[model samples]
Target chain A: KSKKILIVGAGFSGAVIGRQLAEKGHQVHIIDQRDHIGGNSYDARDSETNVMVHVYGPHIFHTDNETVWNYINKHAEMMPYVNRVKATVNGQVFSLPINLHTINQFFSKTCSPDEARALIAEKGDSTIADPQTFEEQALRFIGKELYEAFFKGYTIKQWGMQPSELPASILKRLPVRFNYDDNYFNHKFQGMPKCGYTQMIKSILNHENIKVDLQREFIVDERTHYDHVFYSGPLDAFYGYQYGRLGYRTLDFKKFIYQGDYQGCAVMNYCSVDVPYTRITEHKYFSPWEQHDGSVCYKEYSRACEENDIPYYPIRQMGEMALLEKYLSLAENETNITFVGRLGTYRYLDMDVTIAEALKTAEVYLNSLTDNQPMPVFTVSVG
Target chain B: KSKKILIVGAGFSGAVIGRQLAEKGHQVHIIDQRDHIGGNSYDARDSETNVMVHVYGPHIFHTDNETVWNYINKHAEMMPYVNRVKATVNGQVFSLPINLHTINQFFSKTCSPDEARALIAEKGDSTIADPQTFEEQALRFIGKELYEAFFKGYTIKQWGMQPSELPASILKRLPVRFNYDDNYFNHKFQGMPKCGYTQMIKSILNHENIKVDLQREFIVDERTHYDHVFYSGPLDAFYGYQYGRLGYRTLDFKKFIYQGDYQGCAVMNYCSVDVPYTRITEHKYFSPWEQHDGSVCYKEYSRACEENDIPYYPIRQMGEMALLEKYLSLAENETNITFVGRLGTYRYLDMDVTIAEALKTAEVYLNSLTDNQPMPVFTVSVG
Candidate 1:
């Protein structure tokens, strides 16, 4: 039997489920506060420069999941892409992922893989075995010099907090490879669709049973039209932040265009406290297949999110989880609405993981329908 | 520890591996004989209309794999798109996917859900217990009238073969829905990037470690410049068509521009045999989010691929698989090179499948490096 589905926030989560259910004999209507389909992943061709611009920031698709990897290939052309991040430390440019090449170059030592490992171990603080904070984690693994050069200033700029204040899990998340393999992710698949994200999302919403209304926010009175609601918008925003807003970090990008090549690379991270901006991304470099005489770039700045600021990353700091727990309890009591995505879950997610969870959410809902059961409010167990 | 890798094609398979290896601290070089990237998925802004045009017909991304869905979201935003394909049959428009609305409209009968099921069963040939050909499968599934109006002429034009000669697997692939779900695919994720395909391809090649050379054909002498090679060009072209060329259907798109909405939709299929062209695609409708007063469109014509013509779809009939097997045997004997992508494997592959396999190929090679095993010439088992 077909269902009437309402999807709030026309990003990945809403888009995936909306398309899926619509295919399975459901009437789906999608609404977004923003005029575009892709929420943060929204991109458009710059009219003047003719460059495809990531309105929020750069998004590079990389994942290890075979099923998710195969799913996206149906809509857009997945081009070959690898994110080889470079960081500028002190005054020297260095390769990221903190590999053998980075370590050897930083210390001016021509060491093999094993030798590099031994050198890091010797340099590391062996006293603190189990690290508690981000500072301790970096010191225990990569040691002071490497950590100070690579992780310290960059972390401070990105999170707007001292490394000592953050959890060890944050620093531990990134791998320090002994080999010269500097790939940022251990994922099996990585690439970009050979088009802007908005078009890809538009394709997802292209159906007779699906109607997308842009610039239309989900009002309090709109629940009557939909039998089921899948919300990808902020959980706090949906409940009108009655329990108080969740903590988040916001980013400001200073966009500029130049006549010629600017950075000579896609992203150049400034790993120094002296530099105000965290990184600078060359837009032309983002799409290297196209030849252009001029280049567009964005200088990124990160800071504590304010009341009306666009939230980029969730700040899972002190008291935030307690507040989130309160909101979840509120969301738990609500009927017919399922909260999904990074904003709804109050966690920072990579693009790949977000879609993976969305697919899982849709699968769970479909299975529940098959079993003649109600769809759960949460796909992943949250607070 | 950075290995030198050479990819002999700028398409998904070669591009994906090149980007992956490059991310893993490898010097990756990609060479394409063509002047552009994305191979057939290549798109550009039309000079006159300022519309992002699919130069090689429409390539819509749709997939059930969660990993692939998430993977592409990282690169370009996947727009919410449902392909409600409309077919012009017997001088009347009809909804596609052969759903309830299409069935009801075609037969001019208002039938209930159970009635529609029974009607199809009654109309469909019960004597054809086992279907071997496209025509037999269509007859057994939807009956003769619906088959003649929708499947018969379109299939003939698309493959350039009689429905009787084509395999049943082709028609069997499409689902005959009892409900009014007009979606072309049942995939969990479906979309197209907002920008053009060329830009997306450029993003895939956007890395410091990867270098792409356009208008450079693969030469046997170029193999010495790198440690490994991935060939995504035609399987026959790689070996100089040693065992004769593979069979394929080539497409020719006659492009034109207009001041207003061209077709009011992206794709319009002419389902009658009297029509010379198979379908017409309006470029503006591909990106519905973007508002354009002017529109550009393409009339697609499919024919038997000739020598020197660009091959579109591989026709896996008339002992073609046998010929492909001989080529595979020769490809397996190669020490440093691996066949990949649609042309390299001599099979039709969607964009997601191509990337998924390419990622697997890179993973296998990388895993082999870790375990000290040799990289195989083929990632997927060939016929």
Candidate 2:
């Protein structure tokens, strides 16, 4: 028999689950605390300029999963977008991901790929056989000069902590390329939604069996009416912060409208210590197909999440680990509920990964019904 | 009825035509002047490093045509390859196609898209309402400083003539980009054939109905045996240069073995007049997916085509126009033959366009067979 399912938080996770479940002859009630369906992915056009602006921040959809790509493709037109990010360091603009171009620009030397690779090896801390901290990890891989110029200040601004204070695994990757290719994404499929992500998500929520309600907070008591509940809200918020609020780094956006183009690229990272903002995103660049004489830019500043602040990036460092474990344990005990998405799972999930995991969650729940097995609270590991 | 078809030159044009006709139950004979099947697109593994080297030049497959893209996909494994070119100009390396980064680097000032656009306009010669020559066009569009630094010297060396002697249409389109995108091609589908193009073409000629002969030059009298023939060789050569030789510029490639990479990128253009070679292409970089300790870099030098030299680029200018028209007139009188591809048509056609035109020729021939009508010598225009 079909079940009555209530999907909490109408982000990609909720919309995806609802769409899948609704298609399989189940009644789905999808609700979000935010006034919109797409959550952070929601975007709207500026009244003055008619340029589509990302309400929360710019989101570039990229994935290697064919299934996720195909699923998203059905919902919206994915415009071809390869994110070529740039950094402003030492009063000079450099290509991001520390590519060959960036290395050449920084050193002001035209080194071949192998030559550049050798140069970095010479500059890097050779004596450090093992790295223990983020600073050591970065220094071991990229060297002190490059690390300080590109990663140190940016990490300090983003996490509100010194690179040395962070774990080595945080900067585990080399984050260096010895080629002129400045494509920011390594995924096989990378693009932005042509109609903006909100419209795409809105299409995902358009099902006869699915009823979506905006600004509707799901209380624990509301589970009595539904046979099953898929919760995508913050795990700590679900329990009303009973075990203390799990730490999160929220973004404060500062927007400035200009008659003409403000920035040449989609994302520009302010890597220098003097700049307060982490990055500046030109919204129009994301919609490369569209042309607008006017431009809308959003400058992002990452800070500590307050009680009332919208929880963005999960702070899963040493401090939040113990607290997250406690909340995850509490979540494990619950019945008739499945914790999903970035917030519910308490992790930083990319857009593609979120949709992929949600689809998997829905399939598992469907399979549970067919096999007459009890549904688990957590479909995947909290970590 | 199925007929005997002979295709000349054994390149994409001849191979595509033969393959299509062979599939339609016709006997096909193909011949190439060289030992290879892919003509200029052919590549061989370097004996030292085992890296696939483009024998003629770096042939990057790019096309907006889905039909052409799909056809190539069936024949070969098209590895995703986007050409991000770099240039050595004014003793400094800069991004090619003159993007925002190049503009900023050249001027030593950070400029937004609009600001960059305004700066170029300000630097441009507003006095010249109409540009008659390449030099005048470049000055009017990008300004004297940028034109001289980026284009003027390169044009002079490339064409072996002053920019002022060339037509304005040569530099008709605005080459300067206001944004940071430095993609050399604006095609939807862009890639390089896996296992080298020679192997791909070998696969195309594998049909039972087709017989391929290597290093075999097709004589005019050879057409007597076949019911129809597709000539993909030079039109002038077909007539034995009776009227006169059509102008061509042949490339002289000098390759040196390097322990590692010589240039960081696949193709690096030397825009400064001091450099004799047009560009240096590191063969191993083209095969980005493969790793090789040793690299083979090919430096391409262009000069006037000699009597016995292997012609590469067709020089279709004011001098050659008279010679081409005479050859084309002689070709127009031909029966039971079709002029196809770059050499046959006497034009500079990109790989995709050549393949596409060949496919169209096959379809047109098949249509002629079905309709019981005579096939035209040229399915498409010479231009």
Candidate 3:
């Protein structure tokens, strides 16, 4: 028998889940709190400028998952777009990832890969036996000048905390290269939707059995309306914030219109915290295939998440980990629903990973129904 | 089915063909003019410094063709390697392909894609409606400043003449972009053989049916010894230089050893005629996955090929093209000997393309015997 499914949040996670189930002979209903279909991934053409405006912010599609890549290509014209980020520090421009080229530019002296590595080793804090904070973490490896110029300012602005205030293990990975590759995401598959993300989302939601609604909120008591529910919204919000609000970072964008081009690249990072905004993103650069007479740019400011704020990076701290555990305890007791996606699990996820888990979630759901097995409360890992 | 097969040279072209034929039940006999097996791609660890030195020169493997990539992977431990070439000119360094980052660095100011496009349009020579020379071709697109700084001197040194003297089509493809992609080659699959190229050749030559011999010349009378001869040696040399020598650009590498990095990149181009040398290559950077105590580099100088000079690029100047046609005429009239590979076909080929054509050449040779069809004297296109 075909099941009736209700999916909350019409993003990659919800859209993929709803579409997959609908295609597999089920009536799937999808909804989003916002009026748009693509959620944070939405992009629309500017009213004044012909440039495609990334409504939420710049989103470059990059992933190594073959299945996720192929599935997205099925619904969109995937055009080549490698993320080559540029950094402006010490009043001079340099390539991102602090590569051989960037090192030469910064030092104003040409040095080979090994030479640069040796130079950094000499400059680095050898006395830092064990890093106690973010500052020490960077200084121990890349050295003070590089850490101060690139990591310190960006980290402070991005996390809204001082480098010394943050934990030592906070640096997930250092973005450093010994070569001339400035590509931010060196994934096997990297591209942008030629149709922009919103239209791509619309294409996935165009299935007959999949009914999508906007400006809708899922009430926990209304669970009986559907056979099963796939929750992609915030885990705390789903439980009515019974526990304290989990820590999350949000962004504030102040856009500026340029007659032609604002910044040369899609994203130009500000390595100095004194500069105010974290970075500036020119949307015209995102759509490399198209030419625009007018340019659209957004000066992005990252800040702490609040009750009214829209979340972006699910930055985890000591409080977040503890609160998340408590939330999971209440989440496990729930029935007739499954937590899915970035917000549902309270973790930052690549768009590909979100779609990958959603597809797998649908697979497990289908298999469970076929074998008369119990459906999973969580198809993907929470932590 | 076990026919005796003779293959000349031991480069990728010869190794791939010999191994493929041997695996296909042919008794393949391979020989090289040099003591080493890997012809132009030969690499050996320097006994002095313990660094893997590219004996012939630095070679980065990259390709879009699947068969060629798959075949090479079978014989080698492929390590991820992307070619991000940098250019040194005007007393400073910049990324190649004249991208937005390069433009910004050159101008000492940031210009977006559209602005850079407009900027270059202003600087570029619009009067050159039909570019007849390499200088005009570059000037009409990137302007005289960029052309002179990045292309002119390098081309002069590389071709042994002024760019204006070369054909406009000699530019092949204008490697200029308004975007920030400085990746030398963004092929589908790009990597380096981990065990060095020579060892990879040794792996392919490991088949029991294959017998390899070095420092052995293919005598004209030796063609009758084997059932057929796949000659990867120079077509003119194979025909005893009857059509006179075809023009080829040969490189002369003046070696240098550094305690650490020298140029800070794999290849650094000298865009000044006064520099004399075309480029400098740091061999240690070629094997980035390994650490070296000392560095090996080559100050590469390109010039006209002499009788004893080891040819690299089969430069297709007017005289060379005309002379190559004459060599082909004599080659086509021959029996049981097929002209193969870069020198055989008188064309510059990537290592992947060489292997691809070799495998295809073997496929054609096998099928011809089964169908009683006439065997081709030349397996691949001459041009």
Candidate 4:
């Protein structure tokens, strides 16, 4: 008989581990606390929008890993998708990662690449040697007006915090391109599964030896039946939070219904800090191939996560280190279980990385089990 | 004296590992091949837009884990950021996720939520007892006019595949509001870090017991210096792809600068499938709080990933699984290193999940080392 193993959370981590282990002649039982597999990667059709939607939210597939990408593409065909994002700022629509086109359009200039570059340079503020706050950094790089019109309000609206308290570095990923190309990602592969992620995951877990249980919560005592268990739940929850809880942010999307067309785009960001909500998204636009007479859209908002709320972003404040350390010790002492995935690890992970790690984790488990080595207490960390 | 632990890569995985191990009184040294830390999450100010641009790409932090959120918040103050996306299809703008409002607008019907629902039902193709492909799903629910106008061309442009070949579930997560709210996300906590992710990571790794070595590559020869090594590189590269190389897609962006503002919004996706380029991003709009006289932007394009390509999305085709199994077995036998992170595991991940996993990995590692347990070669899997 194959060695019986149990894997929790059948999303990226669970699906990957189950596939690897089952293919290797090990019996893996995969379970998820949600109603379906593929955890947050799950996708389905919207009854109202008649458009494809990211169940949890928008999840773009991007990575620099060929193997992991190849692995995912096997079950589902991934079409090329470059995140061409747009935003509405200062009452004007612009491109995201601010590139050359955005500058010219926002400023009503038709400058060539060279002219665009020079003009922006002349317009930028060169005050601080090293900027401190988000505002200062913006001023030093772009100019005073652009900062106020584009970043200042939107940031305040989204974060609900003053720019002064924030560091200058947070503004790194915004792009200022020299050309007019607007593909969003800079990675090697970018696209969604030809099918939705849900079916793709179902196909990945289509193994006779692997059985999946959805909406099933695993307790500590549940590990007795399996030789090994791979957990993708929250690490703090695993320890039952003997220490104080870690900090996190959750999201609340306000869904809006419309007839025919909405904003006419997949997404529209409200960067003004004064705006009560962030940006708005039209679901029908996500998949250009399908046409829907009706449209569904949402306005995104950010806030602090409450006790019963679904955690979104990890605050990672300075003082939480001591608490994390305390929790780390408790995790260090555990045996037979390896925490995995976003919640399990208490850190952010891209889809490709999560899948890749799951495969690697399974490899390690098999090696240790075959060699008769003791199962590791911990296998990863939150850097 | 603390136990010496060497972590390869300073992205989310390495960063968290360093933090956890150092806090556990272990001397942790993290080395990345790149000159800068924060791995792929690094961002910097755009000279033109002055908006924070992701050097690698935009990374939004969204998760449902409270502990993980708190853990990240410990390092830096988070700026509230909601991704408000916009797309232009056929020269018309629309919101994403096809919400109810979009339906009203696209169809040129002033239907109430109930009226819109009734109208859409009239056009529904109920023949599909269970929708299968993207096309089928759209036709069955959205009707022909909407499907043709919104999805067909866009899907082709985005994925380079026929929607019919893809799964029906791809169109999941449609947003429909009974009222006029337009929030994109449904999560509780959402925002950008006040400090760029680079700074946040730097601070996270600032513990006295942790040493971060940027511009350092983890060659095969460097694997023996520490008691344990966390490998966050590509898995195929780890095994040298003894099997054939995997397949993926890559991207290219044409950048430019302008005078005052560009595309009024941060990002505007081109909805016409005929539009060769995917979308445009204006970095300035990312942080509207900042002011700049000029703006920066980029036009993004999608392409197939070559063998020597950067590998963006993993293509797990039908035949790829067989080869992956071989690689998995080989990885199983490898000792002393753990493959983690997006590149290492090969799947796209959001920032929040990445951080969560990094923390969990640290917990797994701590447990293994402190308890004298054998570190498994792997600990997680993918969907």
Which candidate's TM-score is highest?
2
Q: Where is model 2 more than 4 Å wrong at Cα? A: A19-26, A44-51, A64-67, A70-80, A194-196, A199-209, A256-260, A290-294, A363-374, B125-133, B366-374
lDDT of 3 by residue, B70-113 (tens): 87888888977767777877657788767888887887765667
In model 4, which regions exceed 4 Å deviation? A125-133, B1-383
Q: Give the backbone clash total of model 4.
A: 301
User: DockQ: which candidate is best?
Assistant: 2
* Cα lDDT, model 4, residue A87: 64
Candidates in order, TM-scores: namely: 0.52, 0.91, 0.74, 0.51
- Over A9-41, each residue of candidate 4 has an lDDT whose tens digit, in order, gives 888888888999899899898878888787878
lDDT per residue as tens, model 1, B75-134? 787766656575667745555767665665567564544577779889888688889998
> Which candidate has the top score in lDDT?
2
lDDT of 2 at A156: 95
Candidates ranked by TM-score: 2, 3, 1, 4
DockQ, candidate 2, vs. native dimer: 0.47
As for candidate 4, its interface RMSD to one decimal place is 10.1
Window of ten residues with lowest summed lDDT in model 3 chain A: A172-181
Candidate 2 residue pairs that clash? none
The weakest ten consecutive residues by lDDT in model 3 chain B span: B172-181
Evaluation by DockQ, superior candidate among 1 and 2: 2
RMSD of 3: 6.3
Per-residue error at A269 for model 2, in Å? Answer: 1.7
Comparing 1 with 3 on lDDT, the higher-scoring candidate is 3
Fnat for model 3 comes to 0.36
